[PDB]
Each structure stands twice: as C-alpha cells, then as structure tokens.
C-alpha cells in the first residue's frame, strides 16, 4: 500500500540537489516508507501541514530527529520546548513567546536596522565579498549574540554548536557522528553562558531568567530555555539571509522590484524562507496507530517531514520553483506550523527585513563572480560560500 523508496534524504547527493528526489517523494504518494532509515516520509504540503498540526498523534517529546528518545538517550538534555508536548510545552512556550514578543521587537529594531545598513555600507566599500561569511554570517553575529546578552569571549563556539544541534537531528551518519565527536568544547561554552550571572541585563537570556518569578518556569528551567535560543536563533537566520541574497543574485528582476519598493523587503525575505527553507526536514513520532493519506502508520514510528518540499508542492503553490517577492506566502511551513511554529520568527523576520531593506536602498546589482560552495548539514540547507560583486546604487 505504501511505496518503499531507497532515497536517502541525508546523503550528500540529496543535499546537493534535493528537488528531483522531492518530486519523486511527493508523486509516489501522500505517505512513503524510506527503507534506508526505516522511517515514514511525507513530502506533500497537505500531509506535512496535517502532521505539524496534530501534536497529540505526532509528538515531539520522543525527539524531532531520527533518534527515538524512548529508545536511545538524547545526546544532550532534552529541550524543554522543542522536545516537549502539551501541556509541558505550553508554559515554556509562553515565556519565550513573551521574551521574543512584538513589544520586544520595538526595543531592538533601531539597532538591528542600523547594524544592517552599516554592514551593507561596509561591504560596498570592498565590492567583491563573500555573501555568506561577510554578510549571511557577519550580520547575525553582530546583532544576535548581543541581543542575547552574551559576553564577547567564546562566541566562536556559537555557529559550531548550532550546526551540531541540527546535524544531530539526522541519522547516525558521518555528519552526525563527527559533529558530536568534536562537540564537548561547544557544549561547555553554551551551557556556561546559560547561567544567569553570565547574561547581560536587558538581553534575551536575562529576560528568560526574569520570568522565573511568574510561575510559568522555575529557575532551574531558565538555562535550558536560554540554550534553546542559542541553538535555534543563529544558524537558521544565517542560512535564511544567505538564501535571500542567493535568490536576489539569481533573480535580478526581483532585486530590481525590491529596489523600486523597499517596503517589499519583509515579504522578499519571507519568500526566500519558502523558496530555500533553511530547515529542510525534521521528525515526529506517532503515539498511536494513525491513518495518514490512506496509509496506516503504527505506534512509535518516526515520520520524516520534508518542509522544503511542502513549500514547493505544486498541489499548493502556483509556480513553486519561482522566487516571487510579491507572492502571498501565508501558509508556507518554513517556520513550521501549529503549537511549535518557530517562536523566534519575529527575530528572524526582523533581521531579514532590515538586511534586505539595506540592500534595496544601497545596492544596484548583485552578481555571482566566483565558485558557489554548498554547506552540508543533515537538516539545514545553506551555502558555504557565495562570492558576489555588489554594485552601489
């Protein structure tokens, strides 16, 4: 009843060009079985959205990676929000929701926007830059660690730790084993900065500890929630911003439209998240026998969702393979959907908007002038290097 495919969604050939195999997965049926890893797969928008919005049947407490927390030990203490189900998820979710709230965005926007304009002005003085190292990575590093209230010492551990986290959502392949092997120094740094004394006042981390008074979280829960922001809020935005610049470099017509109306900056970034969703796949675990698209899935089974595929499903999107900054992107799953939908999505959109805004107002052309190198990760999609020439407006 369920088609069995040998496609390995965690192979380098899949990372290099996943779109053909993703059509193969979508067109094989609403639910496939991946013999490579003994997990169910759903690649269409309909089933991806259904799974995300049924948290009771497709839980997150048994891990959102391949590993089933009920069968193996998590490589680190489980996240109190990402790897938890309602009701345990509810109160930690509400705290991070308030820490990263609309009101909070107003306190940091000016500094985030100024930092983005300064970076673009700096990059235009150099002309030929690497849109990843010098922009996609440089800008988020200049605003997010400071917004967290982190000290200057040891920030080099942040990106290695984030890449570890997302590699660990994948199967026990080379990418995962190597990341966990080299991980000890990054865990020590991250865990230490999660302690209240090490977080500068007024920052995201200090605000998390400040919510230990309300009865929503206890003091011993705050460090892990700071750990959540250091795990989820840097590497994702880096790939998101890189994807946006990548799209603008490949679709010059859309850059010209963005220039003519910089107020499209926010939707241009949202479209980039749909087009090259930074998080390509993650898992749920069934808590019971469930019928999904005509297929019966047993209890305790891992279900792999193809978020990027769902964002290019022609059953849902018109011209899904076109980057369109005026597209109505509402409904894309680049940030997830349901109770776990990225609680830091307002920070991500703020960084992306103000950066694309700076580009829209200051840059006339973005031309690739060097070898493009991809960055391989079990669950993240992004570039290693994007050599571009920036022409001032």
Ligand X SMILES: O=C(O)c1ccc(Oc2ccccc2)cc1
Which residues of the chain form contacts with Cl ion (CB under 5 A)? 76, 187, 190
For residue 141, the Cα-to-chain-centroid distance in whole angstroms is 16
Q: Is 233 in the site for ligand HEM (CB under 6 A)?
A: yes
Residues 6+ apart with CB under 8 A from 254: 247, 248, 268, 323, 324, 325
Structure tokens at 269: 């970034």
Q: Looking at beta carbons only, is 34 or 229 nearer to ligand HEM?
A: 229
Residues 342-371 interacting with ligand HEM (rule: CB under 6 A):
342-344, 347-348
Q: Looking at beta carbons only, is 273 or 297 nearer to ligand HEM?
A: 273
Which segment (103-111, 119-127, 250-258, 340-348) binds ligand HEM by CB under 6 A? Answer: 340-348
**Smallest separation (angstroms) from ligand HEM to the CB of 187:** 18
Binding residues for heme b: 89, 93, 284, 340, 342
How many other C-beta atoms lie within 10 A of the C-beta of residue 390? Answer: 23
Evaluate whether 247 touches 254 at the Cβ level (below 8 Å). yes
In the three-class reduction of DSSP (H, G, I as helix; E, B as strand; rest coil), residue 380 is classed as strand
When binding is defined by CB under 6 A, the residue of 31, 82, 206, 222 that contacts ligand X is 82
Q: Is 228 in the site for ligand HEM (CB under 6 A)?
A: yes
For residue 135, the Cα-to-chain-centroid distance in whole angstroms is 17
Q: Looking at beta carbons only, is 191 or 385 nearer to ligand X?
A: 191
Which segment (70-78, 126-134, 173-181, 271-279) binds ligand HEM by CB under 6 A? Answer: 271-279
When binding is defined by CB under 6 A, the residue of 10, 15, 282, 306 that contacts ligand X is 282
Residues 55-84 interacting with ligand HEM (rule: CB under 6 A):
60, 64, 81-82
Q: Looking at beta carbons only, is 32 or 81 nearer to ligand HEM?
A: 81
Q: Give 38: exposed, middle or buried? Use CB within 10 Å, 0-12, 13-18, 19+.
A: exposed
**Smallest separation (angstroms) from ligand X to the CB of 232:** 3
What size, in residues, is the chain?
Answer: 393
Evaluate whether 209 touches 222 at the Cβ level (below 8 Å). yes
Q: Is 96 in the site for ligand HEM (CB under 6 A)?
A: yes
When binding is defined by CB under 6 A, the residue of 42, 81, 132, 292 that contacts ligand X is 81
HSE on the CB side for 309, CA within 13 Å? Answer: 28
Evaluate whether 334 touches 342 at the Cβ level (below 8 Å). no
Checking DSSP bridges between strand 39-42 and strand 4-5, what pairing results, if any? unpaired
Q: Is 150 in the site for ligand X (CB under 6 A)?
A: no
Evaluate whether 80 touches 212 at the Cβ level (below 8 Å). no
Q: Looking at beta carbons only, is 60 or 329 nearer to ligand X?
A: 60
Q: Is 169 in the site for ligand HEM (CB under 6 A)?
A: no
Strand partners of residue 304: 41, 283
- Which DSSP state fits 120? H
Stated as kind and residue range, the H or E segment containing 26 is helix 19-28
When binding is defined by CB under 6 A, the residue of 240, 242, 320, 387 that contacts ligand HEM is 240
Evaluate whether 291 touches 299 at the Cβ level (below 8 Å). no
Q: Is 67 in the site for ligand X (CB under 6 A)?
A: no
CA distance 307 to 281: 5
**165 is in the binding site of which of ligand X, Cl ion, ligand HEM, none (Cβ under 5 to 8 A by kind)?**
ligand X
Q: Is 231 in the site for ligand X (CB under 6 A)?
A: yes
CA distance 59 to 62: 7
In the complex, the residues that contact ligand HEM under the rule CB under 6 A are 60, 64, 81-82, 93, 96, 100, 228-229, 232-233, 236-237, 240, 273, 278-279, 282, 334-336, 340, 342-344, 347-348
In the complex, the residues that contact ligand X under the rule CB under 6 A are 64, 79, 81-82, 165, 169, 227-228, 231-232, 279, 282
């Amino acid at each position: 009843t369920i088609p069995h495919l040998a496609i390995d969604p965690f192979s380098l050939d899949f990372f290099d060009d996943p779109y053909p195999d993703q059509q193969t997965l979508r067109d094989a049926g609403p639910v496939v079985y991946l013999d490579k890893w003994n997990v169910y797969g759903v690649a269409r928008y309909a089933e991806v959205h259904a799974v995300l919005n049924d948290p009771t049947t497709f839980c997150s407490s048994r891990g959102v990676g391949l590993s089933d927390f009920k069968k193996e030990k998590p490589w680190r203490p489980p996240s109190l929000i990402l790897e938890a189900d309602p009701p345990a998820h509810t109160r930690p979710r509400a705290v991070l929701s308030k820490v990263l709230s609309p009101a909070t965005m107003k306190t940091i926007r000016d500094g985030f926007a100024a930092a983005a304009d300064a970076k673009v002005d700096e990059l235009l003085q150099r002309g030929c830059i690497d849109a990843i190292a010098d922009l996609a990575e440089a800008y988020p590093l200049s605003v997010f660690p400071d917004a967290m209230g982190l000290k200057q010492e040891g920030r080099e551990h942040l990106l290695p730790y984030a890449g570890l986290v997302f590699n660990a959502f994948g199967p026990p392949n080379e990418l995962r084993q190597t990341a966990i092997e080299r991980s000890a120094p990054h865990q020590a740094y991250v865990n230490e900065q999660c302690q209240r004394p090490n977080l500068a006042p007024g920052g995201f981390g200090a605000c998390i500890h400040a919510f230990t008074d309300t009865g929503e979280i206890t003091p011993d829960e705050a460090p892990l929630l700071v750990r959540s922001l250091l795990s989820a809020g840097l590497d994702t935005t880096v790939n998101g911003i890189g994807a946006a610049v990548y799209c603008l470099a490949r679709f010059p017509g859309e850059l010209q439209r963005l220039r003519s109306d910089p107020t499209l900056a926010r939707n241009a970034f949202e479209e980039a998240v749909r087009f090259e969703s930074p998080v390509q796949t993650f898992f749920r675990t069934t808590t019971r026998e469930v019928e999904l698209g005509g297929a019966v899935i047993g209890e305790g089974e891992k279900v792999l969702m193809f978020l990027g595929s769902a964002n290019r499903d022609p059953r849902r999107w018109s011209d899904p393979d076109l980057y369109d900054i005026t597209r109505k992107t509402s409904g894309h799953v680049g940030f997830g959907s349901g109770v776990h939908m990225c609680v830091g999505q307002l920070v991500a959109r703020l960084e992306g908007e103000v950066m694309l805004s700076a580009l829209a107002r200051k840059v006339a052309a973005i031309d690739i002038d060097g070898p493009v190198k991809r960055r391989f990760n079990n669950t993240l999609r992004g570039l290693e290097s994007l050599p571009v020439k920036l022409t001032p407006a």
